[model samples]
Target chain A: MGFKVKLEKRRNAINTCLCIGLDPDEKDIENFMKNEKENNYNNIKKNLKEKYINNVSIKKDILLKAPDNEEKSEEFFYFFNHFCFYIINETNKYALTFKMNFAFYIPYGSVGIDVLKNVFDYLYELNIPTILDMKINDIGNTVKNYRKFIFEYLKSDSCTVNIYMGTNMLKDICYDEEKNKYYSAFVLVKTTNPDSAIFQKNLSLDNKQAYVIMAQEALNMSSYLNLEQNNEFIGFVVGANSYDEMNYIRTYFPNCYILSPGIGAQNGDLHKTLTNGYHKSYEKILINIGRAITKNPYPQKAAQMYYDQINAILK
Target chain B: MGFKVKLEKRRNAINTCLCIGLDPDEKDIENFMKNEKENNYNNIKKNLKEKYINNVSIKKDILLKAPDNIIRKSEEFFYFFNHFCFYIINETNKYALTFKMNFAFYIPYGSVGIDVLKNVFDYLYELNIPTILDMKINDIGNTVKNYRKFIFEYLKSDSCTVNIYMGTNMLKDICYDEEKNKYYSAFVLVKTTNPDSAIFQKNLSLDNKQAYVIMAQEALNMSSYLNLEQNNEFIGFVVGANSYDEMNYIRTYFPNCYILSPGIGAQNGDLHKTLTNGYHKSYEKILINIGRAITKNPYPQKAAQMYYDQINAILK
Candidate 1:
């Protein structure tokens, strides 16, 4: 079975709703590394002074001496790996999954791509279910190539593909031998973005909002939910702030898994997101937190607190 | 001016409509290469005797030599490159412009990517004008890197990008340096997929269709377009069999170039796509053909024929 169903089941069994997002800015890492260098500068200067004093710019030399590119990439991987490892080890009872946004890593160029690959490798080794928050969608052949690349090549347990292209593209990605183990695409039904209503609500042939129709159609087409002893298929990324609209989606595909982002960091109302947006089963919801958890002064502790609150609310 | 504007002006002057899709499949090339090998086999055998026996499989070896993996990839790039070269030469007089689908070349594995790079190098060297097709929505830093790769490195004349994820992605690719006289992305509105509609369309809150709304907003938001001699900020891909639908929605948005692709390929609709699908004064459209022309028997010659027929039909 795919990681999505397994992940949700694990979340329910552990009663943890935390999905830590690791999207560290380069500036943050450089600053953190700079602090370490500052503490060691005097000792290093003492050792190198006699020969190197008049020859070079100390700051430039220090920057050059700072971690190499590969080292910096490894450090980023270790930060996320350590964080996920800590959460999994300590809050073995509270944390469920980890999400890595593809864009955040993509900007770093080849080094970033390497780090993401390394991070996935580490997470896969740990048996931690990881989500590739790529939002990728394209034609059938391209999607198939992506499936081969991401699933077989990169070895990511699960990924998010945009449903905008159609259910066919989604089907192409999820049809491998590991189909059941692939994370279901949380098809963007109703988004939290402020301008969502403009086009999503465009008049459909039946006069319903186009997005609502798309959600219904997506569920209908992807109805063969492989609830195999160890697998599940469909999921929705219903933004937490759009509970009222999500209720409509819930009516159409009540049994499908839902991943509610826009909570905490995006100012989504978690109470309504849980009480109103979700069904009573509480088995199909994964509340995602990115900046709120990772950007906090003490991320692990903050994640623990949020985990407690979600469990309390779900119960 | 950007290639889109230059293309529109050329379309008006030439009054011809054609977008030669350069996606060549492997099976087609294998057949062509096999035919050539068969024709040359007797002479090769007569001349070399023992060498011929030693290399009896040379025809099959050289023509079908590469492993399935390598052959499949080589076919995609080889055909794409040859198709682009053939079409540009044949249709330069008949059509306003030629378009090369980026995804067709970009998605093939390793050496195939190198082949695509080589194809772009060949096209740039040839100075083919008004070449446009799909690169569907790449991101910012990578988009800039691609711009540098394509424009500064390989030197493609024009390309397209997906809007949404942030307009900066498109801007990064298209940000032109005046002295260089080159352009970047032809930004695509997300809602324009032919067979399916997705979250990008649903995500917009606007009066028009989701794609057009995004296009309009992006057009308004772009600060660089005003500086261009001609307004070329927006280029729309108005696809589908419905001609009126394509025209009505596209024409509403002012100062835009349209690349219409729904003419007797997989999604069959020829008359409407050619005649009524938003080919008018002031605005521009390049009617795209993929399977119909390229997949026909005697491809290069058939491609030449289709190029002639399409130009005749549109210009008349």
Candidate 2:
């Protein structure tokens, strides 16, 4: 029972709204896991690193399916030589969690920060939930060393921040301690670009928008960002092609939790972003989907076809 | 020669606007190239590795004080980081010509902090100076073209530092470069200096683009709608040494846009009233940048010659 009872028990046991974005793209993971016919860029640069390590076959089916045999072959070749741990091991089934994007493994620095601390420590042992798309903004103790290296050395339960360094410098990385969770951030309210209409729809009235003034400061910091709470741990990313600014930030973030990164291949309109992300908080919004399910070649049938069209627009 | 004629030859030979922030502090670059390491946090991890390899004898006396001897030593960890960035650009390129780097301080010593950040950005692009990486990057111009080919084609960085809170036409797709007439520079964070940056850069009684004055009037209307005629255009703004009135209110709407300031010396502000309200009637546009006050001075060349003679005595 952490991260608001683990994302409300994976959104009421996977009656999903999805959130995939595990952006691997090295030619969309060797054309969705090595079906590559090498469409030259200097021939995937000098014969694609020896046929990409002899087309590892996602590490020969993670060592012909190993769980603790042959003494963990170097932790299963550092978890199948990370292609976002084989896109979170073949799309964590119709997404209730997963969002990686720390600017796509920061130009492979430290082999992309040790594969972003081993794919957020293997999305915390498959009890899956993560959201780093790292938009972090800073000030003061550099946002306390990026909240001690992103929520205490990458156990990320949530992230995506930047209300241009405010929301009171993100209450020291939005708290957490002794099981009592506190992480999910989001922030970048109403950014659905095309010159986000010159300033997040700046200056308006009851037809409000400059992210409805950051959805009234994410509902006045939902009292230090709620838990079980105003969809707790402060939220707001709102950009599934801004369905009329999510129909005016769901009447002022009614129980916050917004996420929604431009649905299916940024051509938004996933059934009007899940019928305007259930206008408000009917299952507290989340819809991500990077490169239409990581360039789908059947990533678990593109995560069960965007979780059966976001579970038929959440019924 | 852009960043306005290489910052007008460092303000006609070192007059100054000063922006140094190299951001090292691996326990202050292991106590300024080694010493005081008697177990203080395992003397900054593992007995300062033999006083950091016997301080590679300050780059073997900077490659035997060469102008061209070029003696080789198996590129000793890349010329032991080209003698600590050619000893801080030979003691602060005689007081600043603009250098800024934050891509998370060479990203946590990975690939040896990215080969000492591409050998201190190719020795600050062979001392022609102008650099800025900072990384306040935003996305969706197709993953900002893989962050503009990883900060201008694999970290060559002549300029960067963006956020534009996700707008300002996200740098008209990194301010165009039709192969040659290249224009890339940035600053953009607008109002800052955090006491919770007035809960979202302050005074929002919005009637028209007033949330932090449209972050420098929407980045000078995307650098005067992407300039072409003469006087080049590479956008700017990060304004804040306790913001000299929104840094002279966005320099009265871009009388030559520029501003990188970090509320000066240990974020204390008052950089001589921020170089008398951010200089530049046609030159010194602003760049105080301090960051851990010139790397916690043990005289990084007398802490950049007393901040380059205090901005050349406030431009006389």
Candidate 3:
């Protein structure tokens, strides 16, 4: 079975509803490393020595060093492995789930690709469910290829796919039998980004908001009963940052699993997300916290706080 | 300088317009190896017998019995590398260029990533230009990281970008002045897919078609003139396969230095793409492509034919 099936099973067993976001900005890492020392030269030496000894600690320090040709090449291997190690060690006990934004790691080029692979490797090793924030919606064949890459190779438990390409693209990705073992596709319903309304609010042919209609259709297409047969194959990503829209999304997708992102850093209301968006009977909702947890002054403590808040709400 | 800058200089020097698509399917390689009889048993023997043998041909019959997993993986790498070496050697002589569809190689995962890196390494060795066919239109900071990775690490000459998100995302990528060497971004416009009109041709607030407007705005926004003191930063991707739309796009984005067009072969486009798409000027255009010629019957010859035909047309 793929990471998604094993992860969901574990989540259910542990009764943990937390997914810690780990999108660490280079600047944040550099700042943390700098603050650890008083003298500048000592800081550099300390960082360099740490990197030489641990290799995995380099990402937290190398962000400010303008990547020249040599640095770019060497940093690719170092940072890639380091990012993986960081996620594996940090999210080991506190969080049952992880979410990785594809854009954050990919834009760095080959180094980014290496980092992405390493991160996936780490996630796969822990048997933790990973949500790849790819937001992909391309041609049919291309989507198939993406499914193969994400599910078969990278072994991501679940991925967030954009619905802009249409329902057919979603169907193609979900149609594979082998994919069900490892991969589940989550369709974006109500996003929290301020600009989301620009596209999501379009009027459907039936005069309903496009996002609502898409959500309704997606749930109907991949019914929970059908998904249960393959061990929870479908879910929807409704932004926790948008509490006002959460109720509406729940009205349509009552029985299906809801993956709520945009909690921390994005300033999403946690109380509103749990009370309004989550269904009483289903405990499959994944409360995603990216920037808030990972980039916090104290990530481990912040993660514990988020975990406590969610547990209190569930109780 | 990186491959993108080298390609721009070459495009100007040759006055030739062509992007030779390089996709060697696994099945094709399997057939080639089968016919060549280069199975693991014989391959191992061949390696042991002649450590320094040059271009030593192995038997096809022997290779058929090798484990399917090993054969498939080995063939994928062999064919991809072979395609790169063959095209680079041929295109160098003919003044043609190469464009690799990122999906074809990327979809297969780790082995394919290694395959792509090897191809890029070989291309760099031969001093050839490589354009990555990635229509990536993600957020700003991420795009910047991708540029740094692609330009600095992979050493590709140029890369394609989709302008669906907005210009700010692309702008952020090119904003890094220190990192700007020869890396160039080709903004997509006038796509040749049949349904492109439905999506890109939306009615704008001005009551004008948005496709042309979006293309113009993106072209204007990401213009090299706006970003760089020297005019070697950004380029536009106009689909030459769609002749009429290409003509209109060319007229609209006149200042664009490099214009890449795909949709040949299974997509069905002709050589007149250059002439019809405003390559009538003495300046050369970057012709983008994938699948058709490379995956067509007798791939190597078809690719060579594509190179030959494109050179003949452009040099005419």
Candidate 4:
């Protein structure tokens, strides 16, 4: 099945629109090492060295350049992998999907890459949907390889991208009707950040905000792929706080799904966001809660709370 | 020590501004596997399995999902490592001022390819050559800082490509250093070489200037604001070689910025017009990056020298 079908069905099956974002930070690892009594650094280091250090010899000058960087990176990688596993096992029932941002994992170098692949691979075994939040953009040919990396190599159901390179790059990464390979791509239309309005709202494009032009492009791309029945392949990243623009975009392009971030940590109003942006029948609005749920004391309870809260809003 | 000083000194020593692009693709992998006589697949697999497979246990469902992805991906990774380090860099490092690595190319091979990229970076650091990690990354402020950390601190690359859609302030957060010795710069995508770039980059803003021109002005402003010591071009601009008209128009306004121009042969960008339009006459600051045109050649050494000589001829 296509990612859209899988996503919509998962949304219906789980009765939730909450996407658990697995964006773990370095501070999280430091805290985990300090506060958690069960985390034995020496044992973990021994195991990692036996498994990784002895077999694979990475360059001395790159990621593990400093004296203790090798052990530190190994520790960080172990934390991310175990942390993601624990969170997913705890919160899997409530989540419609999981989105892992590539930035957090990349600081560990090849080990970071390994962790991302392992998490995606683990999610695949559980038969869960996932989104690789890479925000990648490049020219046409370059974007094709990125498509392969995100979809084929990592096996993500959907991925987020930055559309600054134009729709041509979007078309390269999204779908191929001829081959029947369909993967969802969420373009950054209206982001959820302090400086989002600097470019997305402040700039004007063709008598409209720059984001509306992005929405228009999304619509055009979905139509071009002939996936307009449910906006199967193309989607938009509209911040949860941008309720007015979300409403406008939902009204205009009702078929496309909106992956709305910035819910708890960034102070996005759940009530306003759902009231304006939710599609009644399609259920196209997905809310991503990153640090809020991932860093909560009771992660499973947090996931359940968001799921219940979103269900209540829809009801 | 910084990218600007190293780049300028190297440019003067080599007398060429050719940035050899180390973008290896799947086709290159395929050709290497087919053509090379020393490429023994079984031996390579044995070595990889000994070094990687038994040591690190990956999940059964992921990369090796279909059972052959492991073998195929391993071969591809090995091919990319040898092709880049042994063939590309060894043959062409003399004429090149710098090397631009598009992370998109190596990311597909999973962890193995990224390790290859790290090794390549380590070798470049050993060779005393600065590198540009061409990721075209755009994100929120904190996430952008993580990316900066990975590129400069972890991978130890000198520079990177950034998307300025979130405005220049976010860049100010990432690409800034108070110390004169430590400088990390970025190349903002102003006018791209892609065909559909005009839809967004050339759109008329409310201020009547094209969007790319606005981007160029913002880059210039941010460059001036950062104002690193002894750095004439603190921030860089990526003006594609294909768009000579826009490149020519924006070149005069931002004279102190280093322009990283792509799209030489594969994208049908003319060499003379590109250099003439994008070059800053006051300083030899424009770096013409040609990727597969030199990389996929039968004899890459000759190809690199030919491009180096051609670019120097155009400058003269």
Candidate 3, residues A84-124: lDDT per residue as tens digits? 35444655466778887766664444355556665676566
Candidate 1 vs candidate 2, TM-score winner: 1
Give the alpha carbon lDDT tens digit for every residue of B1-316 in model 2.
6566677776777667787877764565545434422423322233223223333322344333322233334443333333454455565655876888776655543334555676567666655677888778887776665666567766677778888767777677676555555676777786777776765556442554456776677677667776821445467777778867667766666666666777678877677776444544543567777757766676677888887787667643
lDDT of 1 by residue, A1-315 (tens): 456556756755776666766655555455444543566533333323323222221123332243334555355543332333333343333456777766555433333444456556656655566777666666664466666656765666666655654666676666654554443565666656555554455435346665676676567656554423336465666677776777877776677677677777665336644544575466466667776765565655777788777767765
| Cα-based lDDT at residue A140, candidate 2 | 48
Whose lDDT is greatest here? 4
Q: Candidate 2 or 4, higher DockQ?
A: 4
Compared with the true structure, the alpha-carbon lDDT of candidate 1 equals 0.50
Comparing to the true complex, what docking class would candidate 3 get?
incorrect
Which one wins by lDDT: 2 or 3?
2
Arranged by TM-score with the best first, the candidates are 4, 3, 1, 2
Give the CA lDDT, 0 to 100, for residue B268 in model 1. 51
lDDT of 1 by residue, B210-300 (tens): 5545554554455345343244534444343334454455545643445455445544555444434444433345454443354444545
TM-score of each: 0.65, 0.37, 0.70, 0.86
Of 1 and 3, the candidate ahead on lDDT is 3
Cα interface RMSD of each candidate: 6.3, 8.8, 5.2, 1.4
lDDT of each: 0.50, 0.63, 0.53, 0.73
Across residues B115-148, which tens digit of lDDT does each residue of candidate 3 receive? 3444443443354455555444443354346444
Worst 10 residues of 1 chain A by lDDT: A50-59
Residue A11 CA displacement from its true place in model 1, Å: 2.3
DockQ of 1: 0.11
Backbone clash total for model 1 is 13
Find the 10 residues in a row with the least total lDDT in model 3 chain B.
B51-60
